[model samples]
Target chain A: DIVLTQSPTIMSVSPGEKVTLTCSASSSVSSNYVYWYQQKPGSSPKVWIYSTSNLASGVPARFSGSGSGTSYSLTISSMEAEDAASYFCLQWSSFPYTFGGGTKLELKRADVAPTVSIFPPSSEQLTSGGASVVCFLNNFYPKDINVKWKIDGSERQNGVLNSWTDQDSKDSTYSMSSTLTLTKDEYERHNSYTCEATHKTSTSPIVKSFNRNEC
Target chain B: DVQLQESGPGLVKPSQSLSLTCTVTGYSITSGYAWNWIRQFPGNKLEWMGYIRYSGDTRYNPSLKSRISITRDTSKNQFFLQLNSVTTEDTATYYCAIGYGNSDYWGQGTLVTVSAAKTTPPSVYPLAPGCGDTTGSSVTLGCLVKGYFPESVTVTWNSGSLSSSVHAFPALLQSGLYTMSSSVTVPSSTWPSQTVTCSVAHPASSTTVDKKLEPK
Candidate 1:
């Protein structure tokens, strides 16, 4: 019996990009039969390709399969968000049927700007001993956005920034936070503090200003 | 569009027969479609057993042609499979599907095991005592091992040299176990002083059982 091994257990791609997955068998299957299946998270496996390269009924045009002998491949001309799933290859040419382990396809979002917000709506932080002002950003892509803090029009060096990918969000974006610690004396005396966010698609940094006198 | 469902006994005795039915829905048996029986071992190797055409033509795998038969009933739109002289090697998950060469619709598999029908060891007895009459000069001994899962076994009789003509008779019980016996005959002159032994070996057991016959 021949064993089939698949390469690249997982792949991440942006929408409209092309992707291909490969399955290699230990020996030649003579092109008698090879099959591909798609399995979403909670759904049963559905046949995507049958008999080497023929598409199963109802499969989209972007999905295709090719190859023979010992090597086979499944390719998507343009990836869609719904195409994120696991795939398997089954060989039926010989006795003792075998299946490739599996490959997971994930969508990687890019070029989306974050929605920025500042914590503490009023000037009450000016009276506290110290205030941990957080600059929160959400609904961003690529997770590589830059965050900065400006106090009275000058860039501040004491801000801590953190970024994370939100796995629950199907849009493949991120949520981030940048915290700026301000002492009561500084908050009471300073008239202006700003949080700035820089993203790939924005012409200028998105800024949210906090004024002590605005309350 | 058609759907297949398999139903059969969960267990079968060694050297006995096995029977199963494949009930189909959404299509009639006389509609000119071919139906087949396939099985998969735990190791995941699949076996294509045979197929029956709506026109009553039947075909079987060459390896299993001697013992396998496929039949169908048009009244119920179902097909049946009967395999004779089963062994532990026959244990597998069986499926029914539409089409002979390509399977588009399949039924969930049902598993079957060829094991022992009973739990008792074979009892050994002296068929004929080692006594000399004016015309009789031989002794016969027999051992019957029953209720063992699987039918394949090695039965042997031993003394100074192993007995060559050990006859074996295996029968399948209703419960799917095998009851089998082996016997050997020896000359009375040689039986008097020999420690004769009868042993049975099967894959179901790690060790063989020996019944020793000593001089009285």
Candidate 2:
């Protein structure tokens, strides 16, 4: 099985400039070809790149791929605001094929790394008994924001992430922390554990630890 | 354009060979298309069993080669598949397929079951198991018995009476019926590349049979 990972949560690009998204395979599946797809905010995904570099049926020629071995990248030679949604890479060369976590390409927005990470790393903790998980949101965008906790992860508590500050500004650096604990059994739980943090303005929410196995 | 339709008895007795015909309807066996057979078992997946081309270029899924054969009767515009070693699990939907490389298209599969049947004559019911694939240290053997169902069949190997381990996969079907198969991975020590046997019980007529495999 090939696992893919992405870096730098979000990226910004101006009109007609190129935006590149990186994908790394866990093993050497270089013999298999890599593909890229673009998913707009509410539409189904479409193939932009296939077999490493030939564009799919109707894709523009601007999309291209480069790199070898465990490292690869999808480069949109000229970034159009229409390309502002999310870009993902998939590898078909291995069993249990997979996709990257997704990189959001924004228009006119500043590039900032989001602090979203899946936590706990154990599904048994949530199912065998009760699960206690802590979301350490250190060094983030805003001085104050609301945090929410979700559990297998569905039920939402009213005040999971209360506004907390660690003396950082909207300009230089901002960080905070939140925690969620769930008391539930495995059979009754249906992957219902999650957490979300919302900040002001045009930025994707910083998500921390969606479930127990996400550690 | 050429098409094939398989018209044969769908059921056979365990420890019996399950035979089916791919009757070409639209195309002649002389066409360049490589005719093949593929089977999928119940609740399981599909596997390439083997192929016989119009010109008789042939290959079998190494796992099933000894147990399967592709012979054509151009006189009837038909090709046939003969699989031995009956087991319930071989009761999968069998498909007649066309291929150049990887499969490009397949026919609606016909279901075959290895079970007790009045239509099968007693003579076609018994057969010897044969060697499938032989490697330097590992080897596979195949069997296509007649008259008996797969449930009453067992394949065992012994190096000086030590029970060798065996693993089995069916020809893409379910119930482990009519077309059952088992493989024993032999570490060079016990086998030194030797023969294995397919024995039939229950049906009373099946005799223990063997095939010798030389290590590669």
Candidate 3:
């Protein structure tokens, strides 16, 4: 079960420059408590650092986090304009909290350096309670994207939300999205919820939280 | 090329009910993006194992969280993970990640064990740090905790002026994944922008995720 391994499957950083993503956890977990999340190109998933090195609430100290055990590192020193895209590392210490297999932060264009893909789902069946939630954003140069739905943290707007965007080639990458729906006891009690992705020039957005099965 | 694979059902017999599925492959849009289901526990470490975005907006990992269920299926790109009754400790090894804060993209784990189990660990409080500014210049707060696999959890660092410390670090990478870090050294003259907090206790779930340090 305890397997969180990520190496250089792909990593390219430029523009003020700084990129480091490594999450190794097979056992020790170093006392377990590490976090780092960033995904550009269509947005959603921005927790620049948590537990392993702090930062995550307003996130933007240039994004930094050191290591102690099981090897931890999430440094984005200086890079803006939406910081390109792709970066991940999460482990809440056993149960069902696992992530660490992503590192696609590119921005070294002159001829070409734009490639980020994560779009799937045309149809799937497995209902009994049915569930759905979607949201994404891409390298449109940044104009401040947005998505929200909170409960304990406040703001639910009425229990539903939606957003979208497009543009693949022709220079200037673009792709945006959003979705919402709930029912299962409002999920289950609630302990505050979140799903935000804002951008004015990058400071915070990319926060996802909301509860239910806890599986 | 879009790919995400996770198939569940290796073993489940204590009470019964442990399913899994995340079979995605290149482009479907799903209205935009947001689909997840992460899990890990053999030696122990890596949890949050819950998410179902695209708008259904959901989050869980309050700790094994009493059984579990996360859903998403843009049409067949696949996304579903359920954990119920069961036992053998609930085994371990389950993963299915994609976007938003890390989980960048993962799927290559599933074990499941929880035979004669019971489970416990959830409900905890205390998050403080801020309100000490005399002029400002003194900050060193800390609080860290890792999984509940083989067993071992403790990270306490309370403060009034300060005096309550405990630091035990052992869980290198895989087995029994345990990592604890707790620090406190505030005096930004008194406590600048002020606000220091971190608390965690595991078995099921005990929480605290904070950071409010300003005095540079």
Candidate 4:
């Protein structure tokens, strides 16, 4: 069976933008049957494109697929918020049928900055001598963002950050969180700790600060 | 401009017959086109049930061939699906589609569930233990189970007190019956006990099968 690798696993596109997603096969697929399916969150996958570039019945003209041999692409002429979902390419002509790893289309919303807040707002215990401070970034889009930490007014390098796009939201925005662990001594010794988020859409970095004195 | 609509019962009993009708509008049944039925199981794969042509040529999925039939009526411009001896695995959202491989047109899907059915016990066959170690240091034991319905069975291997993990490939369907196999690695030291057990459990059936292997 030929394996398919879909690039740009997560594509962020604004409404009305034209975007193309690619699926590359391990071998020539000129003789294979290629199909494209659209699966909305919590919904069954629908065959929107079949037999290479032919659109499925009743599909809007804006949705089209093309390419052959080992390479193929699905292009949306005018992206719509309703098109927010995971797209998959399936090849049936090969033994052990296979599907490309899905490509999730996320809405690159503008003018919406993540609301940042500390997980506990206030914390008292460093009993185990360590406490975790989670910086929550909520209701944002175009998930690519940078989160940095500062301890006692100095940049900290040992922090771990993670981000994800939420599909359950109506607007297809993303929510992310980053956690910083501090030893009991570090929390008590440091006067202020801050989590700064940098995103392309934000005019300035959004910072959420935790004051040790308050804890 | 052909439109297809599926009509069937929402629920079907186990071991019973299931039927559905696909009504076509704006196109005559004698018109040249292949009318088909397709289904999608929630959280599972889509199934191409079968299709009927205007010339009366009919074909079906091999797994469903014996139990399924597709027929049509020109007077009413409709086609139908008749499935017999159905079980819970048959539950799915069925759709009426037009065209051959293109499958360009589809009807709104109708969901059908096969409820409250007793599963058939599996016919267990314990294969002879074979030594994979050319040095005769280790041995492998496997068992093949077939003729099971409902397709959900738990297989466990117990070699003395040592319960090793068993690898089970996907099951295959033949004539509505399912076949599967499970294998476990057995140490040559355990072979001395002259005992290996294969147990299959079907949740719906109060009864289960435990086959104790006596290696040849």
Candidate 5:
């Protein structure tokens, strides 16, 4: 398998700036069959450039691609706040292809931190050998945030589901949610559950808890 | 009036070789350009088999690099194709493609069919066991069966085909062939800390690949 490393794993830029992200491959590669995609948090990446430089259908002219032979760059002539998302490069010239590690573009001076919310499992959603707790975060910008589930003071890596970040059409902010699931025994045996969120160096880490006593 | 014509057997038996001839009129075989063989499958997927430059230099698709041979009889204004050990999955309409992306003056095409006994290996890309993207109560795992021709494939959990627990999404076209994603959701209580596999079956291709998600 080939490994692709993207430069500037993270960058902060303001609107109207020219931003260029680069991807370097472990081995040499031809310009053909190389692709670029944009991804917001918890969403499927949207491909915009293919065959190295040809823009995908209906994409704006502000974006372009250049370079070849294991090193390539995707450039945005004038970045908009909405253009602030993670960019990744892909090469399928060979079998078992590879994608870049991804570079996140955070728009500076447009900060909007999420206000965390918690929702207890509804009665209809419980008593069937499992239970779930929902943690919702609202009105965040830059689409760079991490959500985690913790139970009884320990991070519960399993039985935790995350949802795609939803952007309001009329607003620049986005919203997202996560769920923590517990087996019947664990549900009745546990006393606490927590949802922790951290924005990318823009907002402070915030958490909301739902304890057995609160239920 | 420069024109191209491709002639080949319409039906090739499984495991047999395919011999094709491209005869171009109004030009010498090695005058000043390259000639290549390209095929468009029934599903619209296209593959460029090989090419021979005017200087006789040759290049072949990496996938068929070892199995293809291209040569020319300069005096006859004809070039040859000898593709070996092909199956029904290779059945397609072949043409002579001029340098790179120009297919305009290529031959009308020669239809080649290899009945049902064709096969293309399946490659399975599976992810580690984790929670579902939508539901957290079950431990969900997914795999994308990367491209198999004929769109004949099945995803099974321990040979448990078509089970309710397994959800196989519709296959999408990748280069006009098929690429599919399948997911399995098991109750957290079951298969906990256990290694499980997603078995992919390609009826056309006589092979199966099992990608396992181990507890780490």
Candidate 6:
């Protein structure tokens, strides 16, 4: 793969200011067919420019894609609050198309990490041959958090799920819940289970445990 | 103690069935564990094909459900993978492993290629963006990457908070080719100004298609 890399991951600029996001390929992209997109939250990304320099139907001319071969740029002539999102580049000159890390262009944000707590299953549920442990997280800002369930210290990607619908909080914070289900035999044999939440605000993962003996 | 080794043909003619064997060592096939077949693309991408449980029940990835079959020769401590109607996209390094609440022990992978005389690059598409005047404060940017061969193209994004809410579906087979869609979500209200981007990468030719939205 080309291994495209982006610069200034998160570029902070005033609403009236101008900023340019760059994407560099590991090797010379034989064709200069680079493009750009406007990625927003909660939806699919929008096409802004294509074929290196052509603007999409509704896009503004103020923003242009420049450079050739191994390097390309997405520049905003004059920044606006609407232009405060993120930008990155892609090269389609070869197979297994590649993308650059994104550069977020925004005013600013405050990183607020979430507090994690694990609530084990009830005694009846625990003894009924099956149970699901619920992990609750609260007060996280920016809505970006990763929840991982670990059984006896080993991470699990199956038999686990999470849901979060509290997006309209007045505190500008978010919360969510995840569950890890276990069969009777496995639950009895396993000694410890933990919920690890990774957020940008915290250097270390925030964790909470649900111990069968402790309960 | 258990050990696994994958044995199979290195090259398979397109449209033919690709069969492989997993010979287990020091463990009984019926000894209570799920035995699986997983394949890794030329790069880091991996696909979990299917598995047979200790009880002999079998399961498969939905994408491959139609033509995948996992069976075992219990007395021989060997299991098998039978994927029908193979294509160039099926070429990959295949492995056999045991599931212990997760994929724990694995066999050194064996490379298998559904050989073909030619390969095709994908044609990327941008689905129309924006939602009807709904009450939600969010917008979805959509991209479609399809019609590619050697099925390993990756769809990436330059999202708002980066990986916060970018969803990319797997490259799936349709009409004997591969296609997929990916989208990123931004608070509808927040991006009333923020412009996001979508990028699709194809390893076959080291090509990438990027879609950028510049402010008006």
Specify the CAPRI tier of model 1.
incorrect
Candidate 2 lDDT tens digits, A15-60 = 7897778888888665346776675532334567766666666567
| Model 6 bad stretches (over 4 Å) | A1-19, A25-32, A39-45, A60-62, A76-108, A113-118, A122-128, A142-215, B1-216
* Model 5 chain A poorest 10 in a row by lDDT: A161-170
- Model 1 chain B worst lDDT run, 10 consecutive residues: B126-135
Residue-level lDDT of model 3, residues B1-216, one tens digit each, is 566777765544577788888787775526546676655455333355567776766677666566777776667767687878866655666667665343245555555545433333322222123223223353333333333333334444433334532222332222323223334444644443434444444523343433342332
Model 1 chain A weakest lDDT span, ten residues long:
A119-128
lDDT of 5 by residue, B1-216 (tens): 577889987666778899999999987777777787877666333455777898989877667867789989988888989988988788888888463221124677777867543345666665433222223565555555654765557778766743654445555544445556555667766554565678888765678788775542
CAPRI grade, predicted model 6: incorrect
Docking class of 2: incorrect
Q: Backbone collision count in every prediction?
A: 9, 55, 98, 1, 0, 50
- Go through the candidates in order and give each one's DockQ: 0.00, 0.01, 0.06, 0.03, 0.04, 0.01
Q: Name model 4 segments beyond 4 Å from true.
A: A1-51, A54-64, A86-104, A108-170, A173-215, B99-103, B117-216
Instruction: Put down candidate 5 lDDT per residue, A121-185, tens digits, no spaces.
Output: 44433544556666656667867689878788788878655554434433556666565656666
DockQ ranking, high to low: 3, 5, 4, 6, 2, 1
Winner by TM-score: 4
Prediction RMSDs, each to the true structure? 32.6, 25.5, 23.2, 21.5, 14.8, 21.9
Per-prediction TM-score, please?
A: 0.40, 0.31, 0.27, 0.46, 0.39, 0.35
Indicate which candidate wins on lDDT.
4
lDDT of 1 by residue, A1-215 (tens): 57888867877887899998999999999564788878664233556888778888778899988998889999999998888888888786775556787888878865687666554322333343655455556667765678888878988876343434332235665565555655765666777778898888787999876665554
Q: Which residue pairs in candidate 5 collide?
A: none
**lDDT score at residue A27, model 4, on the 0-100 scale:** 86
Q: Across residues B1-216, which tens digit of lDDT does each residue of candidate 6 receive?
A: 677889887666889998899999988899888887877665434455778999999877667878999999988989999999998788888888773321245777777768663466776654433123222565545555656766567666663345765545545554566656555556767553665667778766568877663321
TM for candidate 3 is 0.27
Score candidate 5 by lDDT.
Answer: 0.68
Task: Write the residue-wise lDDT of candidate 1 on B1-216 in tens digits.
Answer: 677788987767799999999999999988877687877664444566878888989877767878999999999889999999998899888888764222367776777877665434333332222223212465545554544654456677773266443434434343454545444556666665776776767554544666665432
TM-score comparison, 1 vs 4, better candidate: 4
**Residue A97 lDDT in candidate 2:** 42
